[PDB]
From a paper:
In bacterial complex I the 14 “core” subunits, necessary and sufficient for complex I function, are shared equally between the peripheral and membrane arms, together forming an L-shaped molecule. All known co-factors of complex I reside in the PA: the primary electron acceptor flavin-mononucleotide (FMN) is connected by the redox chain of seven Fe–S clusters to the quinone-binding site (Q-site) at the interface with the membrane domain. In this work we address this question by building and analyzing atomic structures of nine different conformational states of complex I, which were obtained by X-ray crystallography and single-particle cryo-EM.
Crystallization efficiency and yield were dramatically improved by adding heterologously expressed subunit Nqo16 to the purified complex I (which contains sub-stoichiometric amounts of Nqo16). Structures of CXIINT and CXIMJ states were very similar at both global and local levels, differing mainly in a slight rotation of PA in the CXIMJ state. The observed differences may be mainly due to the crystal contacts, possibly restraining motion of PA in the CXIINT crystal structure. Indeed in the native crystal structure (CXIINT), corresponding to the CXIMJ state, we can identify many possible proton transfer pathways linking the MD core to the cytosol, while connections to the periplasm do not seem to exist in this state. In CXIINT or CXINADH structures the distance between E32 and E67 is too large for efficient proton transfer (~3.7 Å). The two main states of the complex are shown in green (major-like MJ states, represented by CXIINT, CXINADH, and CXIMJ structures) and blue (minor-like MN states, represented by CXIDQ and CXIMN structures).
Residue numbers in the entry:
A (entry chain 4): 26 to 205
B (entry chain H): 2 to 354
C (entry chain K): 1 to 95
D (entry chain N): 1 to 427
E (entry chain 6): 16 to 181
F (entry chain A): 1 to 117
G (entry chain J): 1 to 160
Write the structure that this text describes.
Amino acid sequence: MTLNVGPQHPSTHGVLRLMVTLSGEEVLEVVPHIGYLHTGFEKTMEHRTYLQNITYTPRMDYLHSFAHDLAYALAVEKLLGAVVPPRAETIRVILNELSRLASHLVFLGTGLLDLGALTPFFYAFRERETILDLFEWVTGQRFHHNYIRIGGVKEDLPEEFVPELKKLLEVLPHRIDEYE
Amino acid sequence: TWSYPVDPYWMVALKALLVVVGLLTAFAFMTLIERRLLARFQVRMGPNRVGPFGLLQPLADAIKSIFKEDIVVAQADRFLFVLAPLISVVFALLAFGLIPFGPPGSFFGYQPWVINLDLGILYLFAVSELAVYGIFLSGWASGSKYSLLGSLRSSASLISYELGLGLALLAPVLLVGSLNLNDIVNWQKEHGWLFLYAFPAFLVYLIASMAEAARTPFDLPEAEQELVGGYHTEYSSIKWALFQMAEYIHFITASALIPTLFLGGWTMPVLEVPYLWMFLKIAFFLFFFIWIRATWFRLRYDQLLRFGWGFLFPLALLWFLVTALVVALDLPRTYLLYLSALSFLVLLGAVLY
Amino acid sequence: MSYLLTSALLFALGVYGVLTRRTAILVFLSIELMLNAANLSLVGFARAYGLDGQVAALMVIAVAAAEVAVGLGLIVAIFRHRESTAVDDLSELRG
Amino acid sequence: MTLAILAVFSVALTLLGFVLPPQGVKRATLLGLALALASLLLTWGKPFAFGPYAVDGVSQVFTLLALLGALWTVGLVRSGRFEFYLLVLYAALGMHLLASTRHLLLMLVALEALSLPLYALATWRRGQGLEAALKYFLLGALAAAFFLYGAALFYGATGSLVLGAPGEGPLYALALGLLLVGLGFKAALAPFHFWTPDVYQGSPTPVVLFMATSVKAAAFAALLRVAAPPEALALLVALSVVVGNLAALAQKEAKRLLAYSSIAHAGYMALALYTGNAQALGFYLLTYVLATGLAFAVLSQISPDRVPLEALRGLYRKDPLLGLAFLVAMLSLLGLPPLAGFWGKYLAFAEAARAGAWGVLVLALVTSAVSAYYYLGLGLAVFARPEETPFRPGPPWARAAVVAAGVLLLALGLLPGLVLPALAAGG
Amino acid sequence: REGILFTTLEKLVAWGRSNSLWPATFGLACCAIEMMASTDARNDLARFGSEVFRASPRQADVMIVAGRLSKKMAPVMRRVWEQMPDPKWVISMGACASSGGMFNNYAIVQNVDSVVPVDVYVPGCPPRPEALIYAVMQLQKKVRGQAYNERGERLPPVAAWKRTRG
Amino acid sequence: MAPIQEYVGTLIYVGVALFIGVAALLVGALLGPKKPGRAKLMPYESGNDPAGEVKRFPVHFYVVAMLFILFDVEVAFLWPYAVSAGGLGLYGFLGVLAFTLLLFVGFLYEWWKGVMR
Amino acid sequence: MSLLEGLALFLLLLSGVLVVTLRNAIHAALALILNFLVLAGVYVALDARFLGFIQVIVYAGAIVVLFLFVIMLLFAAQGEIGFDPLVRSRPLAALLALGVAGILAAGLWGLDLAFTQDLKGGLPQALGPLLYGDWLFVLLAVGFLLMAATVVAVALVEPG
Ligand code: SF4
């Protein structure tokens, strides 16, 4: 059965086209077909300022976006010889690990729902919502945040970020232990 | 129907129409309750909107369902495409009248039930086959083999566990000696709550009825996230609504039958109120089942077939043989109480390792 | 008595099916119809002669199920790799 | 208590084959069949009935014949599938049940139980084998439908499903006819013969041995229980023997020709049905089973798929004992003195003449003389010059089996007054 | 019959459809994840009538295009839309869907209204889940006949009721 | 036993249920826009080939169904013993036990061979 | 009786005609299921109730379900492919059907029977002692037949 699991259907997350060559209940071979999300960053970026491109970096991996932001910032800093302040570096690692936790939350929720049960999606997404509240506090944006800069970060943290981050760091160990 | 009177045919027709429209309102508001109970399970809240309690949203939904451009897909069998939903719905609706909701006359003069046929469980088995019938038939008529495959998965799994249902239902017949629901109920009135004697059969009936789309095969399948299920994906306005309606009526019919058959169909040890205890047990099983719906994963229907075929059905026939030995030698009826209690203790102690 | 004549009529109908049908499966279906006509005659004569024809027909049903299982397995094995089931496609064995 | 042995061995080996090699499973099947045969011998003169199940002289003799045919056909088959032995065991038990009852419905159940495993045993997977299996299954299910409606009309004409009930006029005649249709199809009588040539040509030769011996034995055993009218018997015999021998004249292939010859031989055996002596028929079937098993064991040693006529030639030069035994079998199937096939033929004809059917007996004899044409074109071809032909000169198993079969044939032809005295109660 | 030709009946059926609006998401990019956030246990589009979510297109009236629509995805989305029951509406979520957004290039459709008849537009990158709820109430009151543009005109209940499909 | 009146009431039940179902179908069919289009009538999934061209489905479903017919025959035979049990005594118990064990040996063979195939 | 009895017999005959006439395998099978339903109703009317229920459960519920599974695995709905029409065979088949009906009609004609026995409903309560008892041996033979059928089909498919 050369079956065509189409793009977005049935409930194949991350729109993709699959030609599952398959007889029975096994999986002989899946022929993948991609390109349905090709936007052309590698070309569009050639026509944007280096500062402008910081708006283009989060939008490709939109779950762990600050990793894109950090990779691009670091490459430009190496190329033009920039010096990153230590506090800016600490903030950058915090944001990267926070977006990492958000992405890990979304990945595991999507997997469990994809096969398994629906319920455990909501707890992971509640913790993700706390993380997104942190991101709004600091950058004014949920994701695609334009905060990193070639020198460093756009501006400094408000007073309220550290208390809410400690709150989440205290609740998270029990939460992750619950998922486990 | 040894001891029970018969209402006039017009009164039987009236009671039948009442039970059908009551199952309509029942499945609609039970969809509301399942939405909101799932919402409570996952810390969110339900539809405090179009209600107040959301109880006008099924009305809005039905009003959408009609006028929704009921489409007859080309390249699909013109007649069978239309015909299959009616089958799946009718044979899910019927076989609920048998359930006694009270002692005779407790319907304000006439009859708690509609029909009290002498052979009940056979009627249940037969009408249970016809649900799988409608499922795979609509799968075919859809004219999409993608849906057909899910229909076949469905049919395979449901047929397996539907066979298991028979060996499950064997055991209490040996004790009661009648195939009438009221006689079984009165036997549970005298000796008490047949599940106390037949706990293994109770368990296997529960897990078999779970395969009847209740949940945790969950490779029933639904079209979502797998090789799509059967009987849907090609119906738009009214026929899809009818498919889901019948699946839910079968769900609640099983949730009602479980206490009716194994537990104390209404006939409580105390206070003997006709309807309320039966409805409460229905609600109890419904809430436990929704807990399952929320809280447990799929089975891939391969593990589900393996499990049902290798474990449930052999276990059910073994318990049937034990009960048959006991009844043939008739030694006490206390031995079955002891045996079911010990079997429950065994199947429990193996969990807490 | 009308039931026994109706059973004979159903027997004749299944015979016509067996003769007319091009497909092995539909031939087998016509045969099942013949079997059930026989079962109805048995039930009528059981109503006549005291209920033994009922157990007879029950055993008949069981036998029919077994033979259906076997024959459908054979049909699948013969026409799984092979094309259209039409029984005229097999003429190798001749007098 | 032989049926008990059969059922025990079948059910046990069903699961035993999981831990036992197919060779061990074949050894086990052989031991069980021989033990059932020994029990049949030790119970000679001990008729035993429990339910509708009844062991009498007929049951004993015909199940002895079937057990012999099954043993021979199993000896040759060396396939590494223990199911190919499970099916033979099932068929043996089914034929025993068929021969040991008068209940029509239990007879139907036994018929299905013995016939279904043969349909599967007819699959060497050769393309003709599937065609043969298909024709066989379809015509067999049709005849099962007919036999079932005959049993229903029997239950209509009388309160019981057991044969021997008094019986009405036209309706009883109709019920008897609807039973006779299925019984003759299973006995390869014309004009129900069409399946036999195709099935014998398509099925593997050892399976055809098993069939042409045990199936015909059990079929005639069950036929003896029916009170077949003389006019119907006359028609069956005439058509069967005439068409059998005539169409066998035209056959270019050994298996198909032997099938038509078996049609003619069923026509012959149907004469003893006039009186239902069953001693004459028991003897006839003893002789015919031995001869046919011999011939088909030789044909199996030649080729399992198909054996043409010329392949038989040079068989003497290849193996003299095999050529001679094949000649003896052809003569015993021709029914010529001083052979036990002739004695069975004579006993059937004596029963027929005692029944007073003269023209039918004459036509049977004329068609039997016609049969000598191809019976000699087979027996004498053994001496011709060997042409290109595959020949595997068997094991000592099949050699000794063929030789003992021919020896028993000739010995009971010379002194039938040894065994024939005990085909009745068995003194 | 489309919900028309009686003063009471049409308002009643529009009420029904407006509250029973059945979303079918067509997730393309990060707009799709910000729409998945409109269902979590802080702000759920599971009250107004959008609790259930049938992945099939034969079963939903509202088609929510959430993300950048690549030109290779345009025919697929086109046919997913055409394969919907007829009383159907289209929401265009985010800048990439509404206009070409910041990706103004050969790869992305510069207005989804090119391929599907769009009912509601909702700007933002991503548009906030509460902005999406504002859009669905907008569409609600649109199919209620309570929607007007900046020019004063009342808007028809269903777009894709005005096109010569073919 | 039970009177035929309950069976006539059963017939009434079926007639009522079927009448209500046909009423629902009439409402659903009559109330609709009725704008057939080619792409709308197209089966599924963006142009062609939701299932597309696939050869015959796995015989696993056949195996499950045949298994089911045989074991359902089994249950059909087990029911008369289930009702008439105490009167048939140890002898009836032994006969039904023999029947059950035969068909369970068949099941054990088909299981140790398995059908994942 | 005759009012609804004639109705039920006409339904049976028409369903048989459909199952033997229609060239759609699915449609024929559905006609045969309708036939089995009408036939179980007639069974109940003939005081055979358990037998009607098993006719629905096994024959309709299981047997023709497997049939439908087979014909849906192997499409085969448009049977008229590879015709070898032999058009002369259609009137001959109709003739043979009429004759096999007429001979039975002759055998049953002028035949009146005592249909007066108190079956007490063909309930399993009263059928049990016959099944396990006089028919216990036939039952055991049937069970052995079923086991043999399982092994037969299993070894029959068994690709290797
Ligand atoms: S508008 Fe922004 S959030 Fe939406 S798909 Fe485009 S990049 Fe993603």
